[PDB]
Structure 1
């Protein structure tokens, strides 16, 4: 099915012709467009007061990365390298070796935040919920070198955002 947007024939009676002449000489439609911008003047503006007010987000928001822990303080990551295999931008680098206690843990864990496309595939691939994207979106820097995270930087994010990260996972893990 279809419809015609602009298939019309103006009426040629002297009543209608005079109406169009009044429009041409008296600028009726132009003065009708001023009314629409006058009404908006008297509507409440839609602007929020940043940084004292923040735009709404959701539990699924993909922000800054963070390595998490078990409640006992042990690291969740077991150097499986699934996140490194699926990262479409190749922004994760990992090296591993047995720890002094014989456990399977990483020695290098780097995220190049200028390669990362902030896509989420690393937290989908992780089988132990170790790598996540917290809700922080206010981490801009004055140097390129500050956006090349290593494992120490990532564990500090987890130890810093765990109160909020744990809550967001609680509100969305049943959808996953």
Structure 2
């Protein structure tokens, strides 16, 4: 249930002594190292051609956030603030009021993408699949406040990526 690494007492017959001395004087293990490096010289490398080739992702991937809509145009967020109670970073700021037809809807849905730890507790705490953490990861900005999303930016990410987000949720929701 255990083994002894490096507890080999070497042989002292003239065969093994001359083998070790030929290894010392003729550099056998150094040529073994050169052979392994030469072996990787003639291998096809593992380099994908980014941006033209992309690294493989799964439908569970947790990237850029997006507020979704029902298949009628109505937004799914019913202002229940579970995503900001569960948020380990307190990145989500929510303020709500009844809108002009009496629906429980948010007026403030902020996510600070520089507080966010991208762990997806908001999409798994959301009872109506409103906030999701979509598949976009290429959204680097040049300014800090461009990573401070309001409700307009998140609903635009939903409208921008819904054709992908709905298919990822369709592929994954029986594991959830």
Q: TM-score, normalised by structure 2?
A: 0.99
Displacement of 1:27 in angstroms is 1.0
> 2: distance between equivalents of 1:14 and 1:102?
96
SS at match of 1:111: strand
**1:45-98 Cα distance to aligned partner (Å, 9 max, x none):** 110000000010001000100000011101110100000100000000011111
SS at match of 2:163: helix
Displacement of 1:14 in angstroms is 1.2
Question: Which stretch shows the higher mean deviation, 1-10 or 60-69?
Answer: 1-10
Structure 2 gap segments, 5+ residues each: none
Q: TM-score, normalised by structure 1?
A: 0.99
Structure 1 gap segments, 5+ residues each: none
TM superposition outliers: structure 1 runs of 4+ over 4 Å: none
> 1: distance between equivalents of 2:102 and 2:32?
79
> 2: distance between equivalents of 1:30 and 1:9?
23
> 2: distance between equivalents of 1:61 and 1:104?
30
Question: Which stretch shows the higher mean deviation, 151-160 or 10-19?
Answer: 10-19
RMSD of aligned alpha carbons: 0.6
